[PDB]
């Protein structure tokens, strides 16, 4: 019943979040954002200076040629490359993706 | 596990669903935040959505601050279709991000 809550996030934020199927470290996440969809991964890297770094890796296979073509039009270039940023900038990054898709 | 996903949602979307309780219907306690602004509200389900501001834990200082950037209607109880929940979350996010 934390599942009815999961469905609420999904309606509210237009994003599905799952633990990475291929990964087992508990650090990788499959993310599905869209209303016109963009799939990607988020990796969480800490240690070092003890501040969490977020890696973003775009996932393109589940895209038809037509979806892909649609995204190339409305998404900024950098969303098609692997990125790296502080956890604190993560929401703003989510916001970028949200606007780009709308 | 689901606490991790929840943490993720909080960092990704700046929104936390504290709890859920059914009473009249299905209700959700929500916090949305970003100086930082926090707006508490409720989402009720009866499909339509009922939105009720929850201002009881704001200071007067915060109210004034929230008042200067939030559109009047976010201080009222509103009803609207599920098909528009997301844009609403979006309006709140935009308003708090000033």
Curated annotation (Swiss-Prot), chain B:
Superkingdom, natural source: Eukaryota
Biological-process GO terms, alphabetical: attachment of mitotic spindle microtubules to kinetochore; homologous chromosome segregation; meiotic chromosome segregation; meiotic sister chromatid cohesion, centromeric; meiotic sister chromatid segregation; protein localization to nucleolar rDNA repeats; rDNA chromatin condensation; spindle attachment to meiosis I kinetochore
Note: Present with 1920 molecules/cell in log phase SD medium.
Protein name: Monopolin complex subunit CSM1
Assembly and oligomerization: Component of the monopolin complex composed of at least CSM1, LRS4 and MAM1. The complex associates with the kinetochore. Interacts with CDC46, CDC47, GIC1, GIC2, MCM3 and NUR1.
Subcellular location: Nucleus, Nucleolus; Chromosome, Centromere
Its biological purpose: Component of the monopolin complex which promotes monoorientation during meiosis I, required for chromosome segregation during meiosis. Also plays a mitotic role in DNA replication.
Lineage, highest ranks first: Eukaryota, Fungi, Dikarya, Ascomycota, Saccharomycotina
């Amino acid at each position: 019943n934390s599942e009815v809550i999961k469905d609420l996030y999904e309606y509210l934020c237009n994003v599905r979040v799952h633990k990475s199927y291929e990964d087992d470290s508990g650090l990788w996440f499959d993310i599905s954002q869209g209303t016109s969809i963009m799939d990607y991964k988020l990796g969480f890297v800490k240690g070092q200076a003890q501040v969490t770094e977020v890696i973003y890796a775009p996932v393109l296979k589940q895209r038809s040629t037509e979806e892909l073509y649609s995204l190339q039009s409305k998404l900024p270039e950098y969303l098609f490359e692997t990125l790296s940023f502080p956890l604190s900038s993560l929401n703003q990054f989510y916001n970028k993706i949200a606007k780009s898709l709308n």
